[PDB]
Amino acid sequence: RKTQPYDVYDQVEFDVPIGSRGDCYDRYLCRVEEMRQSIRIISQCLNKMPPGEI
Amino acid sequence: VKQDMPPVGGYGPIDYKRNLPRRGLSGYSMFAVGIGALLFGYWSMMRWNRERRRLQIEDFEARIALMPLL
Asked: Which family does it belong to (chain A) (predicted)?
Protein backbone atom coordinates (compact mmCIF):
# COMPACT_ATOMS: atom_id res chain seq x y z
CA ARG A 1 0.00 0.00 0.00
CA LYS A 2 3.03 2.32 0.30
CA THR A 3 5.36 1.17 -2.51
CA GLN A 4 3.07 -0.07 -5.33
CA PRO A 5 -0.25 1.58 -4.47
CA TYR A 6 -3.64 0.84 -5.96
CA ASP A 7 -6.89 2.65 -6.46
CA VAL A 8 -6.97 5.44 -3.85
CA TYR A 9 -4.51 4.19 -1.22
CA ASP A 10 -2.03 6.91 -2.22
CA GLN A 11 -4.60 9.55 -1.20
CA VAL A 12 -4.88 8.22 2.37
CA GLU A 13 -2.29 8.83 5.10
CA PHE A 14 -1.64 6.03 7.60
CA ASP A 15 1.17 4.38 9.56
CA VAL A 16 2.89 1.03 9.04
CA PRO A 17 3.97 -0.90 12.17
CA ILE A 18 7.44 -2.47 12.09
CA GLY A 19 8.55 -5.18 14.50
CA SER A 20 12.00 -5.57 16.01
CA ARG A 21 12.59 -9.22 17.01
CA GLY A 22 10.72 -11.59 14.67
CA ASP A 23 8.81 -13.28 17.50
CA CYS A 24 5.06 -13.87 17.62
CA TYR A 25 4.72 -10.97 20.08
CA ASP A 26 5.87 -8.41 17.50
CA ARG A 27 3.52 -9.86 14.87
CA TYR A 28 0.56 -9.69 17.26
CA LEU A 29 1.46 -6.09 18.15
CA CYS A 30 1.75 -5.34 14.42
CA ARG A 31 -1.73 -6.77 13.82
CA VAL A 32 -3.20 -4.66 16.64
CA GLU A 33 -1.52 -1.53 15.26
CA GLU A 34 -2.79 -2.46 11.78
CA MET A 35 -6.30 -2.54 13.26
CA ARG A 36 -5.77 0.96 14.67
CA GLN A 37 -4.48 2.23 11.32
CA SER A 38 -7.49 0.56 9.65
CA ILE A 39 -9.75 2.63 11.91
CA ARG A 40 -7.75 5.71 10.85
CA ILE A 41 -8.15 4.87 7.14
CA ILE A 42 -11.88 4.22 7.67
CA SER A 43 -12.26 7.70 9.19
CA GLN A 44 -10.36 9.24 6.25
CA CYS A 45 -12.60 7.31 3.84
CA LEU A 46 -15.81 8.43 5.56
CA ASN A 47 -14.68 12.08 5.48
CA LYS A 48 -13.69 11.98 1.79
CA MET A 49 -16.29 10.04 -0.22
CA PRO A 50 -17.04 11.94 -3.46
CA PRO A 51 -20.34 11.84 -5.36
CA GLY A 52 -20.59 10.02 -8.65
CA GLU A 53 -21.47 6.70 -10.23
CA ILE A 54 -20.57 3.21 -9.02
CA VAL B 1 -30.30 14.08 -6.52
CA LYS B 2 -30.11 11.97 -3.36
CA GLN B 3 -27.19 9.70 -2.50
CA ASP B 4 -25.19 8.43 0.46
CA MET B 5 -22.99 11.42 1.33
CA PRO B 6 -21.25 12.62 4.50
CA PRO B 7 -22.86 15.73 6.02
CA VAL B 8 -21.94 19.33 5.27
CA GLY B 9 -19.65 19.68 8.28
CA GLY B 10 -18.25 16.17 7.89
CA TYR B 11 -17.92 13.50 10.53
CA GLY B 12 -16.41 14.06 13.95
CA PRO B 13 -12.98 13.11 15.22
CA ILE B 14 -12.49 9.41 15.96
CA ASP B 15 -10.01 8.19 18.56
CA TYR B 16 -7.46 5.75 17.15
CA LYS B 17 -4.50 5.82 19.58
CA ARG B 18 -3.90 3.61 22.60
CA ASN B 19 -5.21 4.83 25.96
CA LEU B 20 -4.04 2.91 28.98
CA PRO B 21 -5.19 4.48 32.28
CA ARG B 22 -2.19 3.71 34.56
CA ARG B 23 -3.68 3.05 37.98
CA GLY B 24 -3.23 1.61 41.49
CA LEU B 25 -0.98 2.56 44.39
CA SER B 26 2.78 2.86 44.35
CA GLY B 27 4.62 -0.33 45.30
CA TYR B 28 5.79 1.19 48.59
CA SER B 29 2.13 1.55 49.57
CA MET B 30 1.19 -2.11 49.07
CA PHE B 31 4.46 -3.20 50.70
CA ALA B 32 3.65 -1.05 53.75
CA VAL B 33 0.06 -2.37 53.83
CA GLY B 34 1.27 -5.97 53.70
CA ILE B 35 3.91 -5.38 56.38
CA GLY B 36 1.37 -3.69 58.66
CA ALA B 37 -1.11 -6.53 58.18
CA LEU B 38 1.69 -8.99 58.98
CA LEU B 39 2.54 -7.13 62.19
CA PHE B 40 -1.11 -6.89 63.27
CA GLY B 41 -1.65 -10.61 62.66
CA TYR B 42 1.56 -11.44 64.53
CA TRP B 43 0.47 -9.38 67.55
CA SER B 44 -3.04 -10.87 67.66
CA MET B 45 -1.73 -14.42 67.26
CA MET B 46 0.83 -13.75 70.01
CA ARG B 47 -1.84 -12.60 72.47
CA TRP B 48 -4.26 -15.43 71.69
CA ASN B 49 -1.54 -18.10 71.82
CA ARG B 50 -0.42 -16.87 75.25
CA GLU B 51 -4.04 -17.00 76.46
CA ARG B 52 -4.40 -20.51 75.00
CA ARG B 53 -1.25 -21.62 76.84
CA ARG B 54 -2.71 -20.26 80.10
CA LEU B 55 -5.98 -22.15 79.52
CA GLN B 56 -4.09 -25.36 78.70
CA ILE B 57 -2.06 -25.01 81.91
CA GLU B 58 -5.31 -24.56 83.87
CA ASP B 59 -6.85 -27.68 82.29
CA PHE B 60 -3.68 -29.71 82.94
CA GLU B 61 -3.60 -28.70 86.60
CA ALA B 62 -7.27 -29.67 86.91
CA ARG B 63 -6.34 -33.07 85.44
CA ILE B 64 -3.45 -33.40 87.92
CA ALA B 65 -5.81 -32.61 90.80
CA LEU B 66 -8.31 -35.18 89.52
CA MET B 67 -5.76 -38.00 89.00
CA PRO B 68 -5.56 -39.81 92.43
CA LEU B 69 -9.23 -40.83 92.65
CA LEU B 70 -9.10 -42.26 89.12
From this structure: Belongs to the complex I 49 kDa subunit family.
